[PDB]
Design an enzyme around this catalytic site. Structure first.
Site, short mmCIF file in Angstrom:
data_model
loop_
_atom_site.label_atom_id
_atom_site.label_comp_id
_atom_site.label_asym_id
_atom_site.label_seq_id
_atom_site.Cartn_x
_atom_site.Cartn_y
_atom_site.Cartn_z
N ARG A 3 40.04 -0.07 -31.83
CA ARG A 3 39.66 -1.08 -31.05
C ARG A 3 38.26 -1.47 -30.93
NH1 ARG A 3 40.47 1.90 -26.44
NH2 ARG A 3 42.76 1.83 -26.78
N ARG A 65 33.97 1.59 -22.37
CA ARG A 65 34.96 0.52 -22.59
C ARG A 65 34.69 -0.83 -22.59
NH1 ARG A 65 36.44 3.33 -24.01
NH2 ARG A 65 38.09 4.79 -24.39
N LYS A 101 35.48 8.07 -18.78
CA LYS A 101 35.30 6.59 -19.43
C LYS A 101 35.01 5.57 -18.28
CE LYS A 101 40.28 5.76 -20.47
NZ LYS A 101 40.97 5.79 -21.68
N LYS A 103 34.54 1.67 -16.81
CA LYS A 103 34.88 0.40 -16.97
C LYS A 103 34.09 -0.50 -16.27
CE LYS A 103 39.54 1.76 -18.86
NZ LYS A 103 40.83 1.97 -18.29
N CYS A 320 52.16 -2.21 -20.53
CA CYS A 320 51.43 -1.82 -21.62
C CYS A 320 51.86 -1.55 -22.80
CB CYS A 320 50.82 -0.26 -20.86
SG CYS A 320 52.21 1.05 -20.87
N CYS A 326 52.42 4.55 -28.52
CA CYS A 326 51.47 5.60 -27.26
C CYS A 326 51.94 6.96 -27.24
CB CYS A 326 51.45 5.11 -25.99
SG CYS A 326 50.36 5.81 -24.91
N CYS A 365 53.39 5.20 -18.18
CA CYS A 365 53.44 6.38 -17.67
C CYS A 365 52.09 6.26 -16.62
CB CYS A 365 52.73 7.25 -18.68
SG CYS A 365 51.09 7.33 -19.35
N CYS A 369 47.96 1.93 -17.69
CA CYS A 369 47.23 0.90 -18.42
C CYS A 369 47.71 -0.34 -18.11
CB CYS A 369 47.44 1.51 -20.13
SG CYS A 369 46.60 3.05 -20.31
C1 SRM Z 1 46.06 -1.28 -24.80
C2 SRM Z 1 46.12 -1.10 -23.39
C3 SRM Z 1 47.25 -1.50 -22.53
C4 SRM Z 1 47.78 -2.85 -22.90
O1 SRM Z 1 48.95 -2.86 -23.33
O2 SRM Z 1 46.95 -3.72 -22.87
C5 SRM Z 1 46.10 0.52 -23.18
C6 SRM Z 1 46.45 1.29 -24.40
C7 SRM Z 1 46.23 2.71 -24.24
N1 SRM Z 1 45.66 3.62 -23.33
FE1 SRM Z 1 44.79 2.74 -21.49
N2 SRM Z 1 45.39 0.80 -22.23
C8 SRM Z 1 44.53 -0.50 -21.71
C9 SRM Z 1 43.82 -0.40 -20.41
C10 SRM Z 1 43.73 0.55 -19.69
C11 SRM Z 1 43.92 0.21 -18.04
C12 SRM Z 1 43.81 -0.99 -17.40
C13 SRM Z 1 42.31 -1.80 -17.52
O3 SRM Z 1 41.38 -0.97 -17.98
O4 SRM Z 1 42.34 -2.77 -17.34
C14 SRM Z 1 43.88 1.61 -17.62
C15 SRM Z 1 43.98 1.81 -15.92
C16 SRM Z 1 42.81 1.70 -15.14
C17 SRM Z 1 41.70 2.88 -15.12
O5 SRM Z 1 41.07 3.14 -16.13
O6 SRM Z 1 41.82 3.60 -14.12
C18 SRM Z 1 44.18 2.49 -18.52
C19 SRM Z 1 44.03 3.90 -18.25
C20 SRM Z 1 44.28 4.70 -19.36
C21 SRM Z 1 44.33 6.22 -19.31
C22 SRM Z 1 43.76 7.03 -17.99
C23 SRM Z 1 42.40 7.33 -17.94
C24 SRM Z 1 41.89 7.97 -16.60
O7 SRM Z 1 40.83 7.71 -16.22
O8 SRM Z 1 42.62 9.05 -16.61
C25 SRM Z 1 44.35 6.80 -20.46
C26 SRM Z 1 44.62 8.14 -20.93
C27 SRM Z 1 43.23 8.84 -21.00
O9 SRM Z 1 42.28 8.43 -21.67
O10 SRM Z 1 43.34 9.98 -20.80
C28 SRM Z 1 44.65 5.51 -21.37
C29 SRM Z 1 45.17 5.78 -22.42
C30 SRM Z 1 45.30 5.05 -23.54
C31 SRM Z 1 45.75 4.89 -25.01
C32 SRM Z 1 44.55 4.33 -25.70
C33 SRM Z 1 46.53 6.00 -25.33
C34 SRM Z 1 45.86 7.25 -25.79
O11 SRM Z 1 45.10 7.74 -24.81
O12 SRM Z 1 45.78 7.66 -26.99
C35 SRM Z 1 46.89 4.02 -24.95
C36 SRM Z 1 47.23 3.63 -26.26
C37 SRM Z 1 48.65 2.79 -26.43
C38 SRM Z 1 48.85 2.21 -27.91
O13 SRM Z 1 49.48 2.63 -28.61
O14 SRM Z 1 48.01 1.16 -28.08
N3 SRM Z 1 44.46 4.66 -20.36
N4 SRM Z 1 44.49 1.79 -19.56
C39 SRM Z 1 44.72 -1.29 -22.80
C40 SRM Z 1 43.74 -0.89 -23.77
C41 SRM Z 1 42.19 -1.68 -22.99
C42 SRM Z 1 41.25 -1.61 -24.16
O15 SRM Z 1 41.16 -2.65 -24.90
O16 SRM Z 1 40.21 -0.67 -24.10
S1 SF4 Z 2 50.07 3.66 -19.50
FE1 SF4 Z 2 50.79 5.60 -20.63
S2 SF4 Z 2 52.30 4.63 -21.84
FE2 SF4 Z 2 51.15 3.06 -21.27
S3 SF4 Z 2 49.92 2.57 -22.91
FE3 SF4 Z 2 48.85 3.83 -21.31
S4 SF4 Z 2 48.89 5.73 -21.77
FE4 SF4 Z 2 50.46 4.71 -23.17
#
Ligand code: SRM
Ligand code: SF4
Ligand SMILES: [K+]
Length: 456
Positions: A3, A65, A101, A103, A320, A326, A365, A369
């Site tokens: 990314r 991020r 992280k 944001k 997501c 994922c 989950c 995301c």
């Molecule tokens: C691609 C995306 C969703 C989408 O379909 O667009 C995404 C994809 C992935 N996210 Fe996310 N999240 C994405 C936006 C966010 C969002 C919303 C936002 O940022 O606008 C959140 C929720 C808001 C928040 O942060 O509270 C989100 C909260 C999480 C979390 C929870 C983090 C936490 O603070 O607990 C994780 C898991 C972790 O890192 O522990 C994570 C984990 C993951 C990863 C990178 C899985 C991993 O940890 O290995 C998920 C990858 C899936 C894949 O196969 O591509 N993602 N994720 C977004 C990528 C954003 C980017 O370009 O950086």
């Molecule tokens: S919400 Fe959970 S299943 Fe969806 S992309 Fe984020 S980590 Fe993976």
């Protein structure tokens, strides 16, 4: 899974050609996946840094991020400055080791497309005479929860106050460092700014930011949001320029039989004057098209199926990635969304609300995301084919939806929505959104204080 760091989602056509090529010849899926943070992802990379580096792109120890920026402001001239600022905060925050992280976003009212309440630090642009004069700082949003764990919660960002443009970077740095220092040292699940604020107090946190920044915040300057959706189609920009935002389901760019979306964006990139903007809704804006170039661009987008008309409901739905890539996915999201909205579209039509929309999101989950925790109707994956159904958010994204039903299947979700939408269609007030209505009608209690009343 690679990314890129792409502030405000602005990517040149030259850069687009380099990523399209790589996506096709060096990954299992061959797709370009636009994310809801205004950047892109390759899936199943079978080098990437030299490719990125060569076109000027860089791939982000760093708890930072992508910094978002309102992609298509109604007052088109404001974008340039807001974007310049997003880009500066991005480079400024670039290496401290944060507990979790961080944001950040730069928002341009009245559009909250970047979904500020899901972020740690937000700069809401305040303009005067077509010029930015400063920002309203909102801090502390975060959506991630853990199933059954009442010590976790989604939280909206808190207003700290107004600051003149000049104090932007000092404030940005002060917020980062204060979270870094005060962040929970014992447990990572309590290390997010949203947790820290609730522990020490917004005011205690704010006072420290001021001390460290070397300023005193002024009272919040009025701002309001009217929506979070993209402006699908053509919109007049400044000068003789136009912006064509293309709806892309799940932001998945791939050539499908009879819908060469990926080749279509490459063809456009080759003749496109300006550049592209990836939106927080996983769509793409072909930005700065001269009036004379409208037909050429439109011709390609149209041929390629990039302009296939969808319903307003579809345009305002999101999911997501989830399976198959994922590792944390509990239930399908991306691959579930399309047919699922096929069903919602029917129910919408059945109720005479086909021209309406409900901000509907599906997250695979509890990590969240897909931003289901800021939707009017959110689906949070619990297990294969099962989801927690949340209701009660609003169109603008300032309210967290409370859990309505738990661990149910699509047939069960659809049966509940069939009944609720029907009630909304017949009992709603003029212009009343579905979320607001579920709360007004007593279908769900509102979440008034996330940290204390999110869980029943
Ligand atoms: C691609 C995306 C969703 C989408 O379909 O667009 C995404 C994809 C992935 N996210 Fe996310 N999240 C994405 C936006 C966010 C969002 C919303 C936002 O940022 O606008 C959140 C929720 C808001 C928040 O942060 O509270 C989100 C909260 C999480 C979390 C929870 C983090 C936490 O603070 O607990 C994780 C898991 C972790 O890192 O522990 C994570 C984990 C993951 C990863 C990178 C899985 C991993 O940890 O290995 C998920 C990858 C899936 C894949 O196969 O591509 N993602 N994720 C977004 C990528 C954003 C980017 O370009 O950086
Ligand atoms: S919400 Fe959970 S299943 Fe969806 S992309 Fe984020 S980590 Fe993976
Ligand atoms: K989309």
């Amino acid at each position: 899974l690679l990314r890129c760091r792409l502030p405000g989602g602005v990517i040149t056509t030259k850069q687009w050609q380099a990523i399209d090529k790589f996506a096709g010849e060096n990954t299992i899926y061959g797709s370009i996946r636009l994310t809801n943070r205004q950047t892109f992802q390759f899936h199943g990379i079978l080098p990437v840094h030299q490719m990125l580096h060569s076109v000027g792109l860089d791939a982000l120890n760093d708890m930072n991020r992508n910094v978002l920026c309102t992609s298509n402001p109604y007052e088109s001239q404001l974008h340039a400055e807001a974007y310049e600022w997003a880009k500066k905060i991005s480079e400024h925050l670039l290496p401290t080791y944060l507990p979790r992280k961080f944001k950040t976003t730069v928002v341009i009212p009245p559009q909250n497309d970047i979904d500020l309440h899901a972020n740690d630090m937000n700069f809401v642009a305040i303009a005067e005479n077509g010029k930015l004069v400063g920002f309203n700082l909102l801090v502390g949003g975060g959506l991630s929860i853990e199933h059954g764990n009442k010590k976790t919660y989604a939280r909206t960002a808190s207003e700290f106050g107004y600051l003149p443009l000049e104090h932007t970077l000092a404030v940005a740095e002060a917020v980062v460092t204060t979270q870094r220092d005060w962040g929970n040292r014992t447990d990572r699940k309590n290390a997010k700014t949203k947790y820290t604020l609730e522990r020490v107090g917004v005011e205690t946190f704010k006072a420290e930011v001021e001390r460290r920044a070397g300023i005193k915040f002024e009272p919040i300057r009025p701002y309001e949001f009217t929506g979070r959706g993209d402006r699908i189609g053509w919109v007049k920009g400044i000068d003789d320029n136009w912006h064509l935002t293309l709806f892309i389901e799940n932001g998945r760019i791939l050539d499908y039989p009879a819908r060469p979306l990926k080749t279509g964006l490459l063809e456009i990139a080759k003749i496109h004057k300006g550049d592209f903007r990836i939106t927080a809704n996983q769509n793409l804006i072909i930005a700065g098209v001269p009036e004379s170039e409208k037909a050429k661009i439109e011709k390609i987008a149209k041929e390629s199926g990039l302009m296939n008309a969808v319903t307003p409901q579809r345009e305002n739905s999101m999911a997501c990635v989830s399976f198959p890539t994922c590792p944390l996915a509990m239930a399908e999201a991306e691959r579930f969304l399309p047919s699922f909205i096929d069903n919602i579209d029917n129910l919408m039509a059945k109720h005479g609300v086909s021209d309406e929309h409900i901000v509907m999101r599906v997250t695979g989950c509890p990590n969240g995301c897909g931003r289901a925790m800021l939707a009017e109707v959110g689906l949070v994956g619990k297990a294969p084919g099962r989801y927690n159904l949340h209701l009660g958010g609003n169109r603008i994204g300032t309210r967290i939806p409370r859990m309505y039903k738990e661990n149910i299947t699509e047939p069960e979700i659809l049966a509940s929505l069939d009944e609720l939408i029907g009630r909304w269609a017949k009992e709603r007030e003029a212009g009343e959104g579905f979320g607001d209505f579920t709360v007004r009608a007593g279908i769900i209690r509102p979440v008034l204080d996330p940290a204390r009343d999110l869980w029943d």
